[PDB]
Amino acid sequence: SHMCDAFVGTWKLVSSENFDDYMKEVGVGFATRKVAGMAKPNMIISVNGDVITIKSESTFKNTEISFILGQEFDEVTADDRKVKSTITLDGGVLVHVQKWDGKSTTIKRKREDDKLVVECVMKGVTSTRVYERA
Numbered sequence: 092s093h094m095c096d097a098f099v100g101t102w103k104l105v106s107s108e109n110f111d112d113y114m115k116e117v118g119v120g121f122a123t124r125k126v127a128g129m130a131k132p133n134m135i136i137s138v139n140g141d142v143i144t145i146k147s148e149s150t151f152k153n154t155e156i157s158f159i160l161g162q163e164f165d166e167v168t169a170d171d172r173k174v175k176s177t178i179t180l181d182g183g184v185l186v187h188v189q190k191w192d193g194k195s196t197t198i199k200r201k202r203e204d205d206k207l208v209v210e211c212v213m214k215g216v217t218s219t220r221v222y223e224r225a
């Protein structure tokens with residue numbers, strides 16, 4: 092309980108850096124990169140018992156994942172990858188690893204001041220996405 096209290100809520104995307112290059116590194120094609128790169132999603136995080144739910148409400152895609160920390164699950168990502176995901180808490184940071192086709196990417200979500208900072212890493216390429224409360 093209370094593991095993710097400071098994450099819970101509705102968050103709106105306010106800045107994105109290097110996201111096109113992250114998507115390229117992941118394998119996303121041109122048209123999806125262009126449309127996905129325009130979107131300014133709301134990320135909605137809730138907790139009920141041990142189950143954490145993260146929704147992304149956007150003009151590109153809507154996505155939803157529900158999970159228990161440390162317990163692998165199937166995820167279809169916004170760019171349509173079918174991945175196996177595991178999310179843990181490490182030092183107060185949500186660490187989300189996605190595995191598909193022999194590849195791996197990691198998404199970290201953390202609270203910093205009044206922001207929720209999302210860092211996406213694929214090999215040498217990082218993208219930083221900053222969200223604020225909606």
Ligand SMILES: CC(C)(Oc1c(Cl)c(Cl)c(Cl)c(Cl)c1Cl)C(=O)O
Nearest residue numbers: 127132147151169170198209211220
């Ligand atoms: C960047 C992140 C973590 O999720 C993604 C979104 Cl919203 C889209 Cl649209 C795409 Cl296409 C991909 Cl590849 C990711 Cl990883 C976010 O919630 O801001």
